Structure formats: structure tokens, C-alpha cells
Amino acid sequence: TDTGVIGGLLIWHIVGAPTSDDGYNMTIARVASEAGYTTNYYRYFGASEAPFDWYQSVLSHLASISTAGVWMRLPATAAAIATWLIISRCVLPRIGRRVAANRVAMLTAGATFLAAWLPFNNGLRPEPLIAFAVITVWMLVENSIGTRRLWPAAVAIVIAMFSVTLAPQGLIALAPLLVGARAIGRVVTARRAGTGILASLAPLAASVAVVFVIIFRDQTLATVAESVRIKYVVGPTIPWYQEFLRYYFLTVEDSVDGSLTRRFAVLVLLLCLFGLIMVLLRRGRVPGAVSGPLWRLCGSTAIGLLLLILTPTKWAIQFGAFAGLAGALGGVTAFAFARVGLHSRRNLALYVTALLFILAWATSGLNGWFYVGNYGVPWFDKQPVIAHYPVTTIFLVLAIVGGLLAGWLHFRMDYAGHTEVADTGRNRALASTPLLIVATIMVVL
Amino acid sequence: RVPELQSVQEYVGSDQPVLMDWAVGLAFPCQQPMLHANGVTEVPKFRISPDYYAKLQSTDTWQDGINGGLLGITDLLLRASVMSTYLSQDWGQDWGSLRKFDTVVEATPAELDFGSQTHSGLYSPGPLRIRP
Amino acid sequence: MHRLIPTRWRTVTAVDGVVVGGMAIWYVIGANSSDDGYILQMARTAEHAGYMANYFRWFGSPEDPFGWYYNVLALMTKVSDASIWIRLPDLICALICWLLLSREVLPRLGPAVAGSRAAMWAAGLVLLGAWMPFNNGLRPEGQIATGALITYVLIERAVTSGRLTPAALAITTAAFTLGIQPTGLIAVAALLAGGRPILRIVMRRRRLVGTWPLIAPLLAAGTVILAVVFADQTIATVLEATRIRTAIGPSQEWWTENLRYYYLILPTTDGAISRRVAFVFTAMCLFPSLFMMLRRKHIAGVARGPAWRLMGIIFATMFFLMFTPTKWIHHFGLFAAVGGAMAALATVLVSPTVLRSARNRMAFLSLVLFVLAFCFASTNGWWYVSNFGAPFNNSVPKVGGVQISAIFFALSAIAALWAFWLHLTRRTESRVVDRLTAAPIPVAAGFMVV
Amino acid sequence: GKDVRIARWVATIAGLLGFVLSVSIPLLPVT
Amino acid sequence: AATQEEIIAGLAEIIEEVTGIEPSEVTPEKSFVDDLDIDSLSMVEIAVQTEDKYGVKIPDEDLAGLRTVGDVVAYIQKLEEENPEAAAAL
Ligand SMILES: CC(C)(COP(=O)(O)O)[C@@H](O)C(=O)NCCC(=O)NCCS
């Protein structure tokens, strides 16, 4: 799986469409050498990128060696490789020993990671780094909760403060800290008799006090304030109550911003999250995986989705910061449902019809990428058809058929009684390949 | 100018046919609409509309001549002219607008010979003329 | 039957007077819908025309199968067409929905929902808040809501008594309320939600009489609205008019569903302060109650079947709201009764005797304040002439400098910080939370009604 | 000789013809 | 003869399915309308689900004379001791 993911991630570095903000950040990096500061070139009366410009400072030093797009997008592929290696060798072996030894769970985790990473993070945006910071703070908080220590929770805060300074939407790296604050406090209070409470909470505030060095390393306070004031009184911002505008931007007809790939990447994430939560509520646990870190893995995604209300801009490309959580959630979801659908014939039908309805909703959009990355893409201007019928209706009729089948299977537990289905080499083969088949299809597409 | 005014219920009676937009129906329950029977419609004398930003983008595009509508007949047959109207005691409020229809040429209605025929529940003389 | 008006109907509370007298004066001084003149002009000409045409559009094509209800207004307009007289079937329907919701649906959900006064207040106030801005005109949303409520009541009566006659009348009721508007599909949700306990009756009574004496009446009952739909029209003319309306009018294929919610978050007259309650006070009471019914399985006062069927109906309604040819906001008046029935269950589920920990109740209070802040973030404008003299008819309310949604957002943030502090220190026996978190939904609904 | 045997026929007949008569209303001559 | 503690245990599992009252409240001195708020429109459902599990037709002639759980246990006891035709075959 590592070989497959790294190969599909290295061949995408060459034949791959860039994002919308790759000419913007490149120009900012090229013109920031002179002019004395990291200026906003195309807007805001020459205002600076005052709070969010530590990444453009690195891009300005890379751009002095070569401006080739295959070299400037290099810090965005190392982040992807490191994210995948972390997900594969620190996260999945932590949730459980049997969830990482399953040969289908790892495959579907890799496929879901690819399907959630490819449509978003292939540019000069900070999302490839936010998605790595989130998953490297999660593992550090988990390394601090177990194996009781405090310095991992102090490095995690430094990494989170580096992530917050990338973009306004980068504050979702704080979620794995807010979710584990209670366990970290339980670890802290076990030292009150030995050392105290100051010698354990002073180094944790010294870590939060690094943003004042990161932001104000070249400019003053009255300058950052003026920059923010200009950006708020000039530029286009939307309030906190128009937050559904993001999910509307994602699902809109005739747009190269909400494609049939981004829709799939987001809907599969939502399905996995709200299926894992329902299985953890209905049944007390998921046998085989430790229910300790699983609750925190779900709460991190939930709080990260809830924190996206305070951002000023709400485009649909900002969903790329969850590509590290999606890969770790798809595998555990396909492992948890493998048993839930094996001992009941209607849960399998519900799972399959949910996947089919997600496919039906996703496939109703175009397959466009951007300005130039559209030259030769098959369905870049019309929604997909096979010969003459819209393929967005075949999936809908199939989903309705599956729903009727699930209803019929529900209407029979009063007459045929509760029936044990099976446990063989084939009955476990169709109960876990879903969400692998469709993910592989989307990746191949 | 110091205008001399008059009510609408008195100027426009309750007998003359009036083309009311689909928004102004409960505020004018005494005026008579423009009836139609046997495929032929009457000729209106006034047109009542909502305020500016509503008439501009909700009722002038809904009742358009190219999508059935009712403003496909009155643009071919009549000419519309705005009148000066004020809402009593609430000046500065936009209540809507009243218009006057003037004929292009003087013409009287037809007679429309009639007849009957029994179909069979599946008969269809052909499609309607919708778009070019 | 030993009597009519069963002994649980003959009771009078303080909520009945409030609801009745707050609807009987909103019927006089209250606002109206937007498509009132549209239906009035359609109905005042349908007798001279002879076929109940669509007056303003589509080359004079009729209401194709969905016209049996306007033929009642066409008859009412022979007496008079005053606004106070032509709007009676929207007051009679409101009274019927209150009667049913108060004396058939709440006592069915268990002796803990029909024993609490906060639940009755919540049901009444949410019914009022969802009925006021939507179902006071001539749009046929209150009629469809009343039909979908009668269907549920009849199916529950069939399940209770163990008979098929109410389950046979429910099919005719659902057919007739579907024959009103294409948005009437919300009535077959009540049939899908109650299919299992009706099969349990059919397969049990079929071993005494047979299958056909029980199935054929159920077919004659379902297939009887065709004689009313096709009384004047014909399948050929219906096909032609449908072709016209599809080729010209707004079609709005099913994957364009998100427009209905995109129109709600805009600060305009269509989505205003009063036109968001009907949906937010339904979702906010539906989702946490679902997540609480998932984990818990014995709540000591709630019947599981009738409580799950209601959530099933609400979700099936939200699903069936697709596939409709038009995506407007007026289609949110269909929740008038089901939201009132869901608020009364949420009020019991989040009570200090069911939710025992302080931080969960504090989080729910935070969510309530958050949805209030979302509600108060728009203008206070009404449609055509109800907008004359409104206080904040073309601007966001302000208490001076600062808006009102900002105050509720600050209060919600304070409540969330309080809940987080209760979470960190592992506290479950706070005392002021017991005062603050007793029936917050009735208060949040009475605020909007006032 | 029992009225249940009569009701069982009155429920199938006049319940089947009352259904085959409703699907023929859209298909019948009109003037 | 059926014991009282199984009659009550069989009635409580029906009362808990119909209404939702916990079976720790069903005692032989509780009234069906004052203490346990169970309207008669629920007593009809209880008498239907009783026959749908154990064949027992409680006619509405007698469904009104049951004011307490002791009345129910006495009625069942007397009808089962009178008629020796109690099948009790599942
Ligand atoms: C159901 C029952 C036999 C017992 O109820 P009761 O004991 O409370 O009077 C009796 O109330 C009855 O027959 N009710 C039928 C009347 C009804 O359900 N509705 C009346 C018109 S909606």
C-alpha cells in the first residue's frame, strides 16, 4: 500500500492540474525580495500579508533557485508522503493491533487518502501543510496521553502555533488539543505531590508564546493592525451565519470548483464520520479497535468541522485540510462495518445504498479542474454520460432499489425470525470491499 | 404643481376589466379581472403592478410573452402609459404603479362561430406552438 | 364504541386559550402569503373560463392533476371575495391541527410527554411560530400539513385498535392530500413509517377471512382520486400541459435541492427573521433527540415506537422534499405540526431528569442561543403590504450600534466556555444550571412569537 | 349461511371493480 | 395455576411496550388511571396485545371493571381455575 500510494503520488506531481492560487503566491514570492516586505500584489492598496506570511518567506527563498513549477511544488509532496507514512505507521497501529493487520482496511485507507488528497492539495497553498500539522499534532497528543509525559504535548502546541499562522482556516489544528485537554489534565494532576502545578503549566504557556515571535518578526503591532483593517474594510468577507455557503459552493451545478471528485471526497468523509459516531453510540464499542483513541479521532474531526465557522473566506477548496483525517477514518470505518454488516443482512444493504446515493449525488457535476488543467480532460464541460443516458440517474434508481430491498429485509424479522447469516471466506469478502471498490474507481478515474 | 387628486375606487370603477399582476390580488378585491372564454381574452383598460424592485424582476419576467404570460398580447395590441399616484397620508412609500392602456387602432370584437365534437380521451390534434 | 369524544379529550388547560386566541387575532391583523393574488385571480375566472386555467403563464394551460382544492375556492368566491372570508379554511385547519396535536399525538408518546406542562407549552408555541409566517394566506400548505397529520393519527388508531378500517381511510386521506399540490408527497411518509405494524395486522387477520377481502378494499381506497382528478380534464390534455410546464417553466431537477437552503441564509425579504423558525426549531429539536435515542433505550416515560415513527416521518419528509418541480421557501410550512410534535419530545428528552449531567444541558443551552443568534441575523420585512409600518422592515435590528445577533452569539460563547469548564473539571452537580436549563425551548419559541 | 361469507364477497367484488373503474376515467370519451 | 409473580411479570412487559412505564412501578396496588396514567385508549391496546401473545379475549364488558392490578390478577386467576381447557401450548 505504501508503494502504491507513493507511486500514485509521485506520478501526480508531474501530470497533475494545479490549483487556483498558484499564480498568486508565485508572484508574491517573486516580488517580495525587493519592496522590503511581503506585499499583496494585486489588491489592498499595497497592504502586507502581515499575520499569515511565514510560508511566502520560504517560497521567496525557493524561487531564487528556480521558478520551475516542478521545483516550487516540492514542499507540497514531501508533506503528502510524510502524512501518509504517519497515517500508515503511527495512527492505524495505535487505534488497534487488529485494525492495522487487516489487509483490506489498509488498502481502503490508502485509496481513501489518495481520493481525498488528489483533488485538493496540488498547489502552492498552505492546505498541504495544515493537513500534515493536524495529523502530526494528533499523534503527539496520543503519545502524551499514553506513556505519561508532557514534552510531546509541549511540542504539539508549537506545531499548532506554526499551523495557525499559515491561514485563517489553519486553526483546526487546535482541535486535537481541545479534545485531549481532559486526558492531558489527568496526566498533569498526577504530579502535584512531586513537583507542583506551575512547573508543568509554565512550559505549556511558553509554547503558546511563540506566535508573538512568528508574526512580529519583521513588522510591528500598529502595522499588522492596519493590514487587517484594510483587508476587512476592502476585501470580500462573509459573516459567521452564512456558513452553509461553503457546502453550497461545494454542490453547485456547472462549476469547476465543485467537481464530481471534491464532492465525493467530502461526502465520503461525512458518511464515515456519521457512521462511526452512530456505531459508537448504538453499540458500546467496536471490537478489535481500542475505543479510547477512536472517540478522540472522531471528536477531532467534529470540532474541526465546527471551528470552520469563524473563517472570513469560505471557498470549497479549503476542505483539503481534512485529507489526513479522511485516510485514517476510511480504514477504520471499513473495518468497523465489516462486522456490523456480516451478522445482519439489512445493514449491508443500507451501507451499499448509502454509497450508491453518494455516488449519484457526486456524479451530477462536471469533471473540470482549472484554467489550463482542462485541456484534454474527458467530461470537462458536460456531466458524464455513457452513450446517451445521464449516469447520475442509473445510480439513483439503483439506490432506490437497494432501499426497497433493505425495507423488505426489515419487514421480515417478525416472520422469518432473527437469522444468523454466515462467517466464511466469501461472506467476509463482500462485507468489506465496499468503499474500496468505489474509492479505487474514483482514483483510477 | 399642486395636484388635484381622486381615489382609485372612484376613477377605476368595478366594471372595467383590469390587468392585475399576480401580486396585487388581495389589496384590490373590488376591481374585475380580465376574463377569458373559448380561447379569446378581453381587452384591459388599466394595469396594476407592485412596487419598482418587485415589478422589475418578479412580475415582468413571470408574465412574459415568450413563456406564455399575459404581456404578449398587450404589447402587440395596446400602449401603456404611467399615471401619477400617491398613497394617502404615507407619502414616501412605494405602493406600486397604475398604468393606462391606449389602443393602437380602433377595433371591435369578433363573433366566433361555434360547434361541438366528441373525442375519445386519447385524441390529440398536435402539439402547441411554444418556442422557435 | 362506548362514546364519542373520549375521556382524554375533555380537558382544558392554559395553552388552549393562548393558542386559540393568538391565532384568532393573527387571522385578523396578521400577515399573508405571497401567492394570494395569484390564486384569487385563478379562482375568480375559473367559472367563466370553464376549466380552472393557469391565468398568468404557460399559454393558458390548466392545473394538470393538482386542482381539486382550488375548485372549492372557486365556489367560495360566489358569496364574496373579501380577504376575511376567503381565508377561512386556513383557520379551520389551524384549529384542527391544534386539536389533534394536543389530544392525539402527545398522549400517544407516553405518560411523560402528556404529563409535563413545559412540553405542552413548547408544542403550542412552536406550532404558532411555524404557522404564523407561512400558512396565513391562500397557499395550500396548512391543508397539506393537516392531511399529513390526519394520516398519522389514523394509522396510529389502526395500530392501537388492531383494525384495518382506519388504515384504509388513511390511504384515501394521503391520496387526497397528494392530489392538492406536488409537494403533497409528505403524506406517504406517514404510510411508510407505519408499514410494519400494518403488515403485522394484515398477516394476522388474513388467517381468518383471506387475502383478497382485505387487499381489494385497500386498492379501491387508494385508486379513487382519479375520478376527482380527471373529472373535467383528460390524460391527453394533462400530458400536453405537463409537456408545456416542463419545457418552459422552472423544472429544478432533483440534484438542485440545496437552493432551498441557500435562499434561507440570505438577508432578504424571502428569508427573514420570522421565516427561519419553522426550520431551525425543527432541526435543533430533531437531531440531538435522535442522538440521545440512539444511546439510551429506556427513558421510563416514552414509548419507543411512536417516538421513532415521528423522527422517521420528519426525515422521510426532508427526503421527499426533493423531486419537486420548484424549490421555494414557502414549502417550509409543511413542518408546522411535526415540529410542534418534535419540540414536545425534545423538551422531555433534555429535561433535568433525563439529561442528568450539567455539561450536556449547558451545551444544549449554548446550541439554543446559537440558533437564536442565527435567527435574529436578518431583516424584519414582510411581503407586499404587510410590510407597511414594520419596525425593522429593511435593516438588521440594532439595540444601538451593536446588532442583536451579536449579543446572542456572545451569550452562546459564554455558555460554551462554561460547558468546557464543566467538562475539564468533571462536575455534574451544578445548581444554577438547574435553574437556567429548565425548558429553554418554550422560552426561545415564546420570544419569537411575541 | 353466515354474513361473513357475504361480506367476504362484497369486499372482493365492488372492491376490484371499483378499482378497474377508476383507471378507465382518464380514458373515456369527452365532448 | 399461574403464580401472581408471573402474571404481573407478563403484564408489565406489555405495559412497558405500549406506554413505556418501567416494570418496577407495576405493583398489585396501583390504579390504572390515577397512579399509572394509562388512559383506556391504552387499555384497549394492552388487551389487544394480550390476546396477540396468549390467546385471551377480554371483552369490553369486563375491560371496564379492572381498576387495579389486583383486579387483573384475580380475573386471570378465576378464569384459569374455572376452565380446565387452558392449553398453554406456547
Ligand atoms: C376507545 C373507547 C372505547 C374508550 O375510551 P374512554 O374509556 O376514555 O371513553 C371510547 O373512547 C371510544 O369508543 N372512542 C371512539 C371515539 C373517537 O375515537 N373519536 C371521536 C371522533 S374523533
Ligand SMILES: CC[C@@H](CO)NCCN[C@@H](CC)CO
Ligand atoms: C415567482 C412566483 C411564484 C411564487 O414565488 N409563483 C408560484 C406559482 N404558484 C402556483 C400556485 C400556488 C402556480 O400554480
